[PDB]
From Swiss-Prot, chain B:
PARP catalytic domain: residues covered: 9-161
Subcellular location(s) per record: Cytoplasm; Golgi apparatus membrane; Nucleus; Chromosome, Telomere
Superkingdom of the source species: Eukaryota
Similarity-based family: Belongs to the ARTD/PARP family.
Binding site for Zn(2+): C131, H134, C139, C142
PTM section of the record: Ubiquitinated at 'Lys-48' and 'Lys-63' by RNF146 when auto-poly-ADP-ribosylated; this leads to degradation. Deubiquitinated by USP25; leading to stabilization. ADP-ribosylated (-auto). Poly-ADP-ribosylated protein is recognized by RNF146, followed by ubiquitination.
Subunit structure, interactors included: Oligomerizes and associates with TNKS. Interacts with the cytoplasmic domain of LNPEP/Otase in SLC2A4/GLUT4-vesicles. Binds to the N-terminus of Grb14 and TRF1 with its ankyrin repeat region. Interacts with HIF1AN. Interacts with RNF146; this interaction leads to ubiquitination and proteasomal degradation. Interacts with NUMA1.
Name by which UniProt lists this protein: Poly [ADP-ribose] polymerase tankyrase-2
Expression (tissue specificity): Highly expressed in placenta, skeletal muscle, liver, brain, kidney, heart, thymus, spinal cord, lung, peripheral blood leukocytes, pancreas, lymph nodes, spleen, prostate, testis, ovary, small intestine, colon, mammary gland, breast and breast carcinoma, and in common-type meningioma. Highly expressed in fetal liver, heart and brain.
Functional description taken from the UniProt entry: Poly-ADP-ribosyltransferase involved in various processes such as Wnt signaling pathway, telomere length and vesicle trafficking. Acts as an activator of the Wnt signaling pathway by mediating poly-ADP-ribosylation of AXIN1 and AXIN2, 2 key components of the beta-catenin destruction complex: poly-ADP-ribosylated target proteins are recognized by RNF146, which mediates their ubiquitination and subsequent degradation. Also mediates poly-ADP-ribosylation of BLZF1 and CASC3, followed by recruitment of RNF146 and subsequent ubiquitination.
Amino acid sequence: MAHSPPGHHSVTGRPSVNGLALAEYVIYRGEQAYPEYLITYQIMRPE
Amino acid sequence: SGTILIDLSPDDKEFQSVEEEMQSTVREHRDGGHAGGIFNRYNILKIQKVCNKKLWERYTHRRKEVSEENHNHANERMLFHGSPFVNAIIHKGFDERHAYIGGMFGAGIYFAENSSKSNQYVYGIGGGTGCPVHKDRSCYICHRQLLFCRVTLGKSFLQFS
Ligand SMILES: CC(C)(C)c1ccc(-c2nc3c(NC(=O)[C@@H](O)CO)cccc3c(=O)[nH]2)cc1
Ligand SMILES: [Zn+2]
């Protein structure tokens, strides 16, 4: 596992191209996330 | 492990807000569905709260460190994470085994605002070989799981891409 950029705690990946895409994020210490909800699901076939 | 899972009723306001964030953050993907399937919405089957005293205290302790390094601002978000290792994560917590060494932004743990982006990793990098039963990345039958996680971003490095 790597280091955050100096003076930072995470990285934000900004979707500079895709108009509809939302941001993605990276952390490098597992202690910076807590898994709050476990979601069980199926994807649905479009009609 | 110390983890217990509390099943939420569909009538619970907390179930309904989590479902809504799941459903409202679906988007189409540039691979046409290749990695994660073709779909505009999900069928939510269950939502469980993950409760683990040690893991929670480990999170809030680090949250306080980050906050004090960032003008009292943890920059805490709720974000999605899909992985073949969800079952280990909920019992053991996130650590270096759940980081993607070869990821765009370095060897770290990746999260998304789009639930459909995390859905692409449920069966591994690029959707792996799809569901265990049918080897189908677009399986409409087999149950999937995602995590909806509390994440501390602190001062985040902005990467344009
Ligand atoms: C290898 C291993 C532990 C199985 C694993 C690998 C990746 C993931 C994951 N990635 C994500 C990701 N990744 C990216 O954008 C990068 O892939 C770009 O390089 C972006 C957004 C969300 C996720 C996510 O929810 N999960 C989970 C587990
Ligand atoms: Zn299947």
